[model samples]
Target: DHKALAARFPGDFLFGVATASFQIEGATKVDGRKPSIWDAFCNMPGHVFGRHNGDVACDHYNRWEDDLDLIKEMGVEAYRFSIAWPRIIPDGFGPINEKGLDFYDRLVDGCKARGIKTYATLYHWDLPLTLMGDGGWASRSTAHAFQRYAKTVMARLGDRLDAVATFNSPWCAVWLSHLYGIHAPGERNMEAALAAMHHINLAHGFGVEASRHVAPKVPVGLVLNAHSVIPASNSDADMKAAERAFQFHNGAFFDPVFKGEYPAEMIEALGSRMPVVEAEDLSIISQKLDWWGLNYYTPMRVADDATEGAEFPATKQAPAVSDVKTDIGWEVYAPALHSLVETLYERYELPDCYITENGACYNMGVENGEVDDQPRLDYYAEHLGIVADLVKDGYPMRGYFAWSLMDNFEWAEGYRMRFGLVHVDYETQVRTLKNSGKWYSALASGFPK
Candidate 1:
């Protein structure tokens, strides 16, 4: 039945698997890879489930060959993996670790040898603990260090990569890390959050320049997990609140990099706490990219209420629409993806782009011999249709990669959340492809709907 159903779509449409280094590649202490903030944060009480540390997460580092077989089995075009900053430069910006560089060398070469295209992401929120000690991304020095780190990495393995993206999601790096205190190097200070935003944008520019210097032919991009900020009601004040929320979440960094300036509303909202920038930083931040990556999941609904306190400012600031929701209670606004992509491209005119990460986490487990996983399937179907629609509308989109290939460690929520195409038995390290994975694989392999 599956074989007959597998030959529908064209071969040029790329399909890929994704995994972050810190989440899947365990062996935190081996081969000169120093402790990253994730290593320290996961060990702290009340930070992760069962106090699970990723010291030996999927052990991808040791079993990449097996993973390569998994990719070959899936018939995907590329594998999107992240480079651990601490792995390459143990102290953030110092002497390069030959052993650390050697691992990626072998990994990249191994992927190519197996006929798999490798897409490398430079950073994915795991700042080196040494860098965090020096104020992490909240400090400009940390941004400068990322520049040096980028150059070192490109110098070694730039040519082997199919694509190079600078960072995963700057919001997670700045807002989630500094303002919300939900992630590593956690600190709920407004000043630190604002500063972190500037530094994160700076790092992207630096990473872009460094990569271009070394590998001018390779496509360089950045991945931003954008949110559609909507008002709870159609009231005038509520609309303003929604606009502010949009500027805060989407425009704050997007405008700076794409339009060469930050939105005025964000500057007014932060008042004196707005990040300080020197002359010419805007020009440097606005470097044109070869492509852009969007990691879309859901949208946010906000309302205006001054008395609701500061911690939950998003809710207190504006009300939201209540039609659809995800398992994690995120508002499910699929149309927002269409609106978001079209609007962003209109405003910024970015180069080609991709739906790099788009998947939902459903509370699913294997039943009998298969995971029915209808909700996950429906989610992908709806989103994929929207992506197809956007493609037909003349957006320069190239490929789409699901959030992950297999169930691995989900940060903060730890292993509790499963957003993977393949199910993983944490106890036995066994993987079972779910019904959705089969559906996705068939689509990736050019099977008709």
Candidate 2:
């Protein structure tokens, strides 16, 4: 069944591995590169696990040539990576960093030489520290600054990029980071969170314009994370709670981006606190995208119990459906992928879609010259099998990208949560292909047996 599922992905379908600059490309202070918000956040006394920072993560910045070769050897048809904003515009809004520009030029050229398509994302949550100091994403000013950055980067590297995304996981960047105070620039204000969310969407619209203006042939899209909400019981209250959670989590962002309007249920709920959305702002955010990049990790098991997060009064967020879990304690529920995709398709008539990020954080390390990460390998198969089934039913599934190529600095939890096909020894900067990577390579090569 797994082999049939693996074979069902069409030949032209893009197979790739992904990594973020801050997550993998260390050298935080190298060659005119400046500190990102993440650099500042991680430096704080107790923000990250074990006080770890991305000062020298994976050292991919220094070893990109070999890394690209590794990617080529793994039979990756494409490489999905993000450009660090702080590296490009150190001060967030001022002079450009030509050295940083050349670094990416080499990277793009390297991918091209090896016949690996490049999928570039402009911002992956690494905001410049100066920008954060001066009001951050909450300020409307940051949106214009973002447009300038995107335009500049696209002008230089646009022609080489096969596809580009403006932002990755706006909800996590805003709701979790700002409202829940769990991520960088940690804040716990609702009004600020709403403002940041709106501005990110505004910036995304500007990014699409920039990409089309510079490289009209290249595709532009946004990567959004989704979750399926399963009710704890068949009670009426539980059913209503599930519906509310779905609309809040999925519909809130998709509505404005797709339909150029916010959901009606939330407008009244926020009342005065709703991020001062101008009528024209909605039009700008609703830009027609070339494709949609979907990232699904785990489903939300919700209940209509009295015990719920103070921020979300309707449903509790603490239920699970699996006996085993990832290193990050995420329940290994692959079926959630199927339900989430189905629900999103029903919510809106979306464009072509790609599974931009899908992998579990299994803390497997090398032992005796081998990293036997079978759980992670099975995780990929279970999820990929769902994608094949969805494609068979006519979902606009264009491609799939494993979450990462190598383990690096994970946010908040830091280096402890390893979500990579390649294992990394943080001390020696060594990388060894895990069992999952071997299997993935075999699948990519059509499983010659």
Candidate 3:
């Protein structure tokens, strides 16, 4: 039986929900908004699942009031959402779109009126397609552009926002897009991927510096999607493989931010393809951050791949056939949540950390006005129970935000992968709270049974 999980934590513990701008705020071409890389990528045939795009999405741009009301009704203390760069600047630089700024102003005010705090992410992988013309994140000019964008947004909304995150997941922006050739602005070159990775880190640093200049007191941080990596076996080769995976996935980002350098293992792996870093780059990339936001979903098991010139010499193992998996095929291993948090704390002198995004994608339908998403509910209970146990053990865990506020676009998987507490009807633009949403509301209200 699920009890009021909030009561098990410190009174100040934060509970909230999160969504990205491109995923929810559909209205792609309306109100001076131009195309993002995702917009351009969606237009390409055989890219996104079912050829689905976020052209209309959940229509959060037009239906934000009802969405805000739904969030308020959930009793969450905060709402973490992203601002699309395309919407705000239209063409990546110059000519501020007052309409885009005005929309967020109303959103912040709406959240404030409902006693819900606002946590904003400046960039969530929706880089304006116009900016991609200049080599995207691989170009230092884009990093400088992002600094200006951060300052502009913070200047307008800084005082009202409780916290601001510079970038959602830099790894996805760099590695997944450039290295894997799966996401938007897809490229499959190691050199481009490495260059983009370093530049993105630089952009994050510049973003932090800009936010401090505009909103000194407002909490600012970067969000990373990480997982606890494990060896597929106890063999030395497997252990080394796991270590390499960790440095690649976690250290590639965290090391630069917390330790002021990239992992030596990764440096050795990349060799000639290593992104050029000047003497001043580390200093700029290691700017002080108020907190760390971790977006964790599962742990990774790595096995050594003996393939010639393997970038990292490690390959992720297939999901265990026996384990419960999410609709997106992520293994349901909640216990690893604690392991990852502990590992992160031990690795760096991190400030209070928040689970910025953690949820499973389980597509459950609404029947007669309710969605009985028991699998999703169970996922929350299991993961949150781990969080609570860790907090009691003095882990400095401060907040938890579900992966999404509602089901919208799921990147390459598109609308088919649902990761929301609330279910959305794409064709009708209707929002229905899933059973998990009700459970979350109860937990947030300290009234779960």
| TM-score computed on alpha carbons, candidate 2 | 0.96
lDDT order, best first, reads 3, 2, 1
TM-score preference between candidates 1 and 3, better one: 3
**2 versus 3: better lDDT goes to:** 3
True-structure lDDT of candidate 1: 0.82
Kindly list the per-residue Cα lDDT of model 1 for residues 13-71, writing each as its tens digit: 56677889988888899989888888889998977788888887788888778888888
TM-score versus the correct structure, for each prediction? 0.93, 0.96, 0.97
Better candidate number, 1 or 2, judged by lDDT: 2
Q: List, residue by residue over 1-449, the lDDT tens digit for candidate 2.
A: 34676678876777889999999998999999999889988999788998899988899999999999999999878899999988898999999999999999999999999989899989999999989866898988899889999999999998888999999988888888888888988888888888888888899988889888988888999999876888988899888778777766766678889988877766656546766777789888898999989988888888875654544336777578688788898888988888888888887878999999999999979899889999999899989989988998889898889988999899998899999999999889888999999888777655222
RMSD in angstroms, candidate 2? Answer: 1.9
Badly placed stretches (over 4 Å) of model 1 are 1-11, 308-325, 367-369, 447-449
What lDDT score is found at residue 350 in candidate 1? 84
Off by over 4 Å in 3: 318-322, 447-449
Which run of 10 residues does model 3 get worst, by summed lDDT?
Answer: 313-322
Tell how far residue 9 is off in model 1, in angstroms: 7.2
TM-score ranking, high to low: 3, 2, 1
